[PDB]
């Protein structure tokens, strides 16, 4: 798994692969690693499939209840804190989940990284998964805060594609998202094989 | 693996399954478990396949040398002695459970050799993963001094019991009838398992595979 997210001048760009692996056998090549918490909030998954899926779904339920009680949407900082407090109770039990909570609230575009270990840090460019080390290299080498929307898409796409080329547990298709003031939008979903013929 | 052998009225009848598995997957569907030691002596093999093959290849090669020197027909005790002395010296590291059976000047002899080096001389033996199933058939139907056809029937039933009850056994049933005047190697003697016929044809048509590079090298 390879998930990456970076916030430039026009919101947050979220990309990920779609490969699921059970040991050395490829279980799936079309898995969804991005969770649509709500219209303005996104969540990425990496590590334990069942873990991520379940706690992100529980987070979504809490966010929905939060909005009904106070008649307002939850912030990215508050949402990530909820997820951090949630998984902290089972710390050391074996939970395996690395997620990136992205959105746009009152403080602008927000990007937070939360894992099962207990970490909850805010930043501008993150990468989770086994292929995250490879994505970092490509991302950082072409990352700029003034990057144009089209340029930001190509960067994220290329970063994920290079990670699937080196990491054995990464592959499939690159699903891309774009978080804006009006909400997130599904940018594209290109297969890695089709990207290979375009980058070569 | 299901190997078995019995001592009938005038000879030895060996038998075994033909399936070879690597873990819990069938690697070989038509494997040969009955090995040739000499013209009058044969050996069935269970346990480690690589060990059984190399061990029987050595003993048979040693008996051939011995038979050339003395100029006489090899004995089953000689083969039994060579195998047990070798297996005991490897302290069970050469996992080779064999069912040795042949016919010499002292009549038909059936032996069961275990990996550590112990041997038994019985009228009927069974070995392998499905040895208990074959033994059950031998414990309920074996009669002393049976006819050639009756021994072939009992041995076939024993091998079949292990084939349909043990997951490590399968495929066909090979037999080996050894007497003072002949040696019939029946491979196979029975094909109780048949693969279902394909309901469709997925024949790959020419041009279905995309090729990047191709090179042709003519020969002489």
């Amino acid at each position: 798994t390879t998930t990456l997210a970076f916030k430039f001048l026009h919101g947050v760009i979220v990309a990920a692969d779609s490969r699921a692996t059970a040991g050395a056998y490829i279980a799936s090549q079309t898995v969804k690693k991005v969770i649509e918490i709500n219209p303005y909030l996104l969540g990425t998954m990496a590590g334990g499939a069942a873990d991520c899926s379940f706690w992100e779904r529980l987070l979504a339920r809490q966010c929905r209840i939060y909005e009904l009680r106070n008649k307002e949407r939850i912030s990215v900082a508050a949402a990530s804190k909820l997820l951090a407090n949630m998984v902290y109770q089972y710390k050391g039990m074996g939970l395996s989940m690395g997620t990136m909570i992205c959105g746009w609230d009152k403080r602008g575009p927000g990007l937070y990284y939360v894992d099962s270990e207990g970490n909850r840090i805010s930043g501008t460019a993150f990468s989770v998964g086994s292929g995250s080390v490879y994505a970092y290299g490509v991302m950082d080498r072409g990352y700029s805060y003034d990057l144009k929307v089209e340029e930001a898409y190509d960067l994220a796409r290329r970063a994920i594609y290079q990670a699937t080329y080196r990491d054995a547990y990464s592959g499939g298709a690159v699903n891309l998202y774009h978080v804006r003031e009006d909400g997130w939008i599904r940018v594209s979903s290109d297969n890695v094989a089709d990207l290979h013929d375009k980058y070569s | 693996t299901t190997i078995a052998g019995v001592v009938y009225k005038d000879g030895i009848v060996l038998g075994a399954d033909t399936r070879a598995t690597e873990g819990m997957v069938v690697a070989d569907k038509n494997c040969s478990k009955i090995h040739f030691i000499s013209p009058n002596i044969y050996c069935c093999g269970a346990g480690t396949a690589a060990d059984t093959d190399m061990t029987t290849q050595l003993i048979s090669s040693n008996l051939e040398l011995h038979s050339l020197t003395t100029g006489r027909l090899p004995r089953v005790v000689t083969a039994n002695r060579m195998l047990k002395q070798m297996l005991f010296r490897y302290q069970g590291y050469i996992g080779a459970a064999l069912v040795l059976g042949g016919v010499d000047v002292t009549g038909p002899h059936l032996y069961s050799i275990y990996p550590h080096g112990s041997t038994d001389k019985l009228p009927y033996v069974t070995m392998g993963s499905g040895s208990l199933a074959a033994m059950a058939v031998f414990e309920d139907k074996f009669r002393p001094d049976m006819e050639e056809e009756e021994a072939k029937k009992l041995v076939s039933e024993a091998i079949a019991a292990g084939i349909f009850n043990d997951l490590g056994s399968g495929s066909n049933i090979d037999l080996c009838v050894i007497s003072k005047s002949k040696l019939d190697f029946l491979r196979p003697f029975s094909v109780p398992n048949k693969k279902g016929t394909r309901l469709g044809r997925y024949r790959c048509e020419k041009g279905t595979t995309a090729v990047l590079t191709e090179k042709v090298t003519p020969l002489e």
Binding site: - | V26, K29, D166, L167, G196, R198, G200
Partner: protein, 212 residues
């Protein structure tokens, strides 16, 4: 003392335009012995939902009873039968309830959706699931999957018509892959039970496989 046991088995699911197929072998084993040659791994949930369970037979039986009870409770409080998607969602949470002492079962739910189209949901022991076109689980899951990707999804094929999968053609494929799986997988054999799910109820079939 170990609370788990591998009883073998292999469930196959295939989604169509107006149908759904859930097939599996009927052999139940333990170690290297055969318990029974007549043990279907397909369970009829509703009139358009069928579930296939392979793995620890002990967990298969308990999980199957829990699901059945949950479907009845949902109908009592909502006055309607549970849909395939709802059952898949509910099963996900049931599997995650025992996250620290999980069920050793490979679930596959194959039925019809609200639009009458074939729906197939594959599951993971702890609850992770997703909808797919076809899916294979169990001891021969890695033997059948590749063939389905090729024959159903037309992967690695160039000039090909990509003809829609029909019930007739799907039936042939299912029987063919199980025949090949019985030759290599030692846990698959005896018989093959096929459950066809269309708009006119669920139909059941039975094909004999290798006995050894």
């Amino acid at each position: 003392f170990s609370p788990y046991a591998f009883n073998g088995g292999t469930v196959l699911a295939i989604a169509g335009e107006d149908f759904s197929i859930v097939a599996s072998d009927t052999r139940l084993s333990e170690g290297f012995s055969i318990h029974t040659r007549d043990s279907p791994k397909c369970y009829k949930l509703t009139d358009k939902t069928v579930i296939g369970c392979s793995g620890f037979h002990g967990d298969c039986l308990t999980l199957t009873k829990i699901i059945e009870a949950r479907l009845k409770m949902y109908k009592h409080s909502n006055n309607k039968a549970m849909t395939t998607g709802a059952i898949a969602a509910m099963l996900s949470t049931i599997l995650y309830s025992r996250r620290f002492f999980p069920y050793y079962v490979y679930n596959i739910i194959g039925g019809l959706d609200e639009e009458g189209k074939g729906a197939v949901y594959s599951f993971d022991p702890v609850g992770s699931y997703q909808r797919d076109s076809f899916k294979a689980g169990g001891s021969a899951s890695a033997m059948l999957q590749p063939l389905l990707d090729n024959q159903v999804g037309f992967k690695n094929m160039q000039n090909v018509e990509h003809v829609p999968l029909t019930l007739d053609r799907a039936m042939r494929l299912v029987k063919d892959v199980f025949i090949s799986a019985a030759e290599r997988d030692v846990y698959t054999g005896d018989a093959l039970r096929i459950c066809i799910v269309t708009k006119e109820g669920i139909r059941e079939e039975t094909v004999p496989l290798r006995k050894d």
